[PDB]
Amino acid sequence: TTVRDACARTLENTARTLHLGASGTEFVAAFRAMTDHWGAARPHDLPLSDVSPDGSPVEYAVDLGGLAPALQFAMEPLTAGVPARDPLAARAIMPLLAGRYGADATRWSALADRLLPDDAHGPHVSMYGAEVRAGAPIRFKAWFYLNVTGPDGAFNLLYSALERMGTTHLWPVVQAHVHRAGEDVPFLLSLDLSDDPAARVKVYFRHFAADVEEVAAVLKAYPGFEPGEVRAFCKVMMGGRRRFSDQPAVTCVSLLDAQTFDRTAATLYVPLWTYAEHDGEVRQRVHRTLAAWPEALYRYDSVLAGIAHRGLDAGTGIHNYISWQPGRTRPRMKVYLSPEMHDVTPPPLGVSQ
Numbered sequence: 001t002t003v004r005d006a007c008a009r010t011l012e013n014t015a016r017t018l019h020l021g022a023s024g025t026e027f028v029a030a031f032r033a034m035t036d037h038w039g040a041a042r043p044h045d046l047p048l049s050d051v052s053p054d055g056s057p058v059e060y061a062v063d064l065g066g067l068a069p070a071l072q073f074a075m076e077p078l079t080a081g082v083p084a085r086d087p088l089a090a091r092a093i094m095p096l097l098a099g100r101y102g103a104d105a106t107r108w109s110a111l112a113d114r115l116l117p118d119d120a121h122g123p124h125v126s127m128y129g130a131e132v133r134a135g136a137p138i139r140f141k142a143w144f145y146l147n148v149t150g151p152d153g154a155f156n157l158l159y160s161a162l163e164r165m166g167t168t169h170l171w172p173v174v175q176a177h178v179h180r181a182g183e184d185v186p187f188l189l190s191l192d193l194s195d196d197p198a199a200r201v202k203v204y205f206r207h208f209a210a211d212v213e214e215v216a217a218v219l220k221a222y223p224g225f226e227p228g229e230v231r232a233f234c235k236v237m238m239g240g241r242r243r244f245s246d247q248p249a250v251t252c253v254s255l256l257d258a259q260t261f262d263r264t265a266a267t268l269y270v271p272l273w274t275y276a277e278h279d280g281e282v283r284q285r286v287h288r289t290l291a292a293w294p295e296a297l298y299r300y301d302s303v304l305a306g307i308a309h310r311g312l313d314a315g316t317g318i319h320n321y322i323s324w325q326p327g328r329t330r331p332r333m334k335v336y337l338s339p340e341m342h343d344v345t346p347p348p349l350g351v352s353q
């Protein structure tokens with residue numbers, strides 16, 4: 001079975017489980033269009049991907065709280081038998097989306113010569129993805145790697161991206177997000193490939209060797225990130241650990257000209273495959289953190305069952321991340337899951353890194 005056919009089946013089943021209706025059908029078609037370029041590749045025919053830590057080139061993400069269900073995937077453009085840092089596939093997928101779906105390429109085009117270079121220093125140069133909510137149009141996204149000119153270039157490359165978008169006046173937002181210089185580091189730049197006012201430019205940061213208190217101190221700048229609640233969530237999802245000792249915590253911030261009190265300015269991502277014995281333990285932690293919301297846990301259990309393909313206690317690697325954002329009355333959480341086309345229990349930073 002090709003990678004594209006196997007993941008399309010899982011994605012369609014997940015959409016059906018979520019009752020996405022016709023929106024789900026269109027979403028599967030978009031996934032197939034974006035992964036056509038993988039060709040006839042089976043899993044071993046593609047280079048190891050950064051998308052999931054086991055090297056799988058797809059990640060599924062499910063909103064757990066939303067009244068209307070909302071499904072997302074991320075993937076890596078890859079050429080069968082070519083190293084992942086080769087930029088051909090990433091350069092081809094933007095015009096594909098622009099032409100087939102009207103996706104906005106104007107920010108992408110302002111950046112692509114710098115962020116998708118011929119000879120990238122890092123092993124990966126892009127991810128792309130899509131998100132759909134029932135009854136609403138699909139929204140596409142691109143992620144660029146801020147290490148493509150070398151790890152020590154991440155801030156300079158980000159700043160140069162703001163130069164090209166005319167948004168250097170937003171640098172103070174980046175600067176303020178860094179609390180521990182050298183350990184709070186930007187590593188991805190994401191573009192919503194839409195031309196409307198809701199479209200966001202987001203910077204993702206790693207927080208290396210961070211205590212839960214330091215992660216909460218980063219996030220308290222943003223509306224609704226009460227530090228006590230952030231610390232408690234991290235601790236539950238870490239099984240009581242207080243420090244991100246190997247795999248870094250991740251945050252992202254939207255770069256905006258003003259505060260936004262819909263509480264969409266920032267997100268917390270807790271990595272799940274290095275701080276537990278196996279995915280059964282992770283599932284128990286999810287049941288603990290979402291105890292107050294049985295509808296969310298029923299949705300989570302159902303989606304996990306459609307994506308896992310072995311006993312949860314065999315190792316880690318099915319759960320990649322859980323994300324957390326404050327809401328009006330309750331937190332907004334999503335789970336990020338791997339199809340595990342390769343080996344159980346990936347190492348910190350993933351097999352490709």
Ligand SMILES: N[C@@H](Cc1c[nH]c2ccccc12)C(=O)O
Nearest residue numbers: 050051052053059250269321336
């Ligand atoms: N797997 C990569 C990229 C990635 C995929 N999904 C993510 C969600 C959040 C942060 C990063 C990612 C990483 O952990 O860095």
